Amino acid sequence: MNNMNVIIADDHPIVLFGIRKSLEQIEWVNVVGEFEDSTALINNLPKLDAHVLITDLSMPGDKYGDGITLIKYIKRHFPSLSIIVLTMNNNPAILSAVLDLDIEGIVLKQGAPTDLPKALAALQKGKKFTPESVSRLLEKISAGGYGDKRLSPKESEVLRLFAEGFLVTEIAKKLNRSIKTISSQKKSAMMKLGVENDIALLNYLSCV
Amino acid sequence: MNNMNVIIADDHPIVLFGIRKSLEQIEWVNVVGEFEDSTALINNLPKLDAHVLITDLSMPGDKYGDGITLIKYIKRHFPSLSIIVLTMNNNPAILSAVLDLDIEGIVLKQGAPTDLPKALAALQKGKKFTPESVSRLLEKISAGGYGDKRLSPKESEVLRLFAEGFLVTEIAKKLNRSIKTISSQKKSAMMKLGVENDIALLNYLSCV
């Protein structure tokens, strides 16, 4: 008698198809609309009584934004609406940015076919869902977002002093090691962070 | 009858010497102390009536901080005290960070021998001094701190979409160009920013 009205939005109709199959094997879900661009979605959301939107992260919007910004748009403008984000982007920084939006869950498209029905079941109990394929990928950028390889204490110290305005020769004195050592530790640290020059490095460090 | 009491602090005594020569050819300056480490400086500042401190950016502090942080310490703890920062670091990001401290001026050590007496003359009129050798170096990181080479509009767009969570193949579609083109523009843009991988890139962009 009381079921979850769902809207589904994706760029590609074979995805829209695949989701519709998964969801008609669930009696308490009613799909009340499907859309292939963000403009038709946004423009029809006021006309449709929906509890939840399942949507692609990377859907093309000519009006209301793209990607993460489009998800912010929707949250802000339809605040009662629960959102599950469906994506194929398994970059940790991207998945993390998404989760800072306080949406009701994330599902990877190449993650298990069972994840989407779990997401909705969690949501049907007022709960948020996060699959393990996502959980473990967020382990990764455990290291403060450096990546897998953390800075060594010595490496961190060198960069700390550079950021404070010391030139390499001054750091060698301050730390009592050779200039060949210091340059090698800086280089090594810059390699771990993904920076190729000092201005990029100093930019990098000023938000960290 | 009424003259500028100056304190001077540097790691190296040949600098302390050179400054003392420059300043005794100015009758209205009285040097009231000189120091070779930040700890003796800070600990004696309460005992000395000084209007201005001339100090090295990269002075070693075992207690009160290093570099830019040491300059913040001094500002915060001796707020009536005017500070001229003397340095050999001609990195623009460093000089810029320094100028955000609202100090009374900057002088480069390898900049003209006339700059230090100009700095004090400006300060004697209640004015702030900035030599042109510094002014032009700050032109450089005109480009929003990218460096000399700005991103092309096309390059900026590609990075905008990456940051929004689009994969390269999705960007090619969205922008209606080839994947070979998009990858080439991303690569090229990453090269201009000084980033070697996607996580470094996404970190970079989130504060810019």
Helices (H), chain B: 13-24, 38-44, 67-77, 92-99, 115-124, 132-140, 153-163, 168-175, 179-193, 198-205
User: Cβ of B105: how many Cβ atoms within 10 Å?
Assistant: 25
Q: Give the residue carrying structure tokens 């769902």.
A: A6
What is the C-alpha separation between A115 and A120, in angstroms, rounded? 9
Flag if A204 and B202 touch (Cβ within 8 Å).
Answer: no
Of B145, B199, B208, the CB nearest to A145: B199
What is the C-alpha separation between B148 and A114, in angstroms, rounded? 51
Secondary structure (H, E, C), A80-115 = CCEEEEEECCCCHHHHHHHHCCCCCEEEECCCCCCH
Chain A residues with CB under 8 Å of B202 CB are 91, 93-94
Of A58, A193, A198, the CB nearest to B170: A58
- The answer to whether the beta carbons of residues A56 and A15 sit under 8 Å apart is yes
- Give domain limits for chain B: 4-140, 153-206
**Best mutation site among A68, A199, A201, A206 for testing chain B: the one with the most B CBs within 10 Å?**
A199
* CATH homologous superfamily for the domain A4-140: Response regulator (3.40.50.2300)
What is the C-alpha separation between A207 and B6, in angstroms, rounded? 36
Residues 6+ apart with CB under 8 A from A167: B58, B88, B89
Tokens (6 digits) for B147: 């460096």
- b/e map B134-158, b = 16+ CB within 10 Å: beebeeebeeebbbeeebeeebebb
Reduced to 3 states, what is the DSSP secondary structure of residue B187?
A: helix
**Best mutation site among A106, A170, A175 for testing chain B: the one with the most B CBs within 10 Å?**
A170
Flag if A206 and B207 touch (Cβ within 8 Å).
Answer: yes
User: What are the distances in angstroms from CA B194 to CA A9, A19, A194?
Assistant: 37, 41, 8
What is the C-alpha separation between A165 and A66, in angstroms, rounded? 39
Residue B102 exposed, middle or buried by CB count within 10 Å (0-12, 13-18, 19+): exposed
Chain A residues with CB under 8 Å of B92 CB are 199
Q: Solved by what technique?
A: X-ray
Q: Which of A33, A27, A72, A26 is nearest to A50 (CA)?
A: A33
- Cα of B119 vs its chain's centroid, Å: 17
Architecture per CATH, domain B153-206, reads as Orthogonal Bundle (1.10)
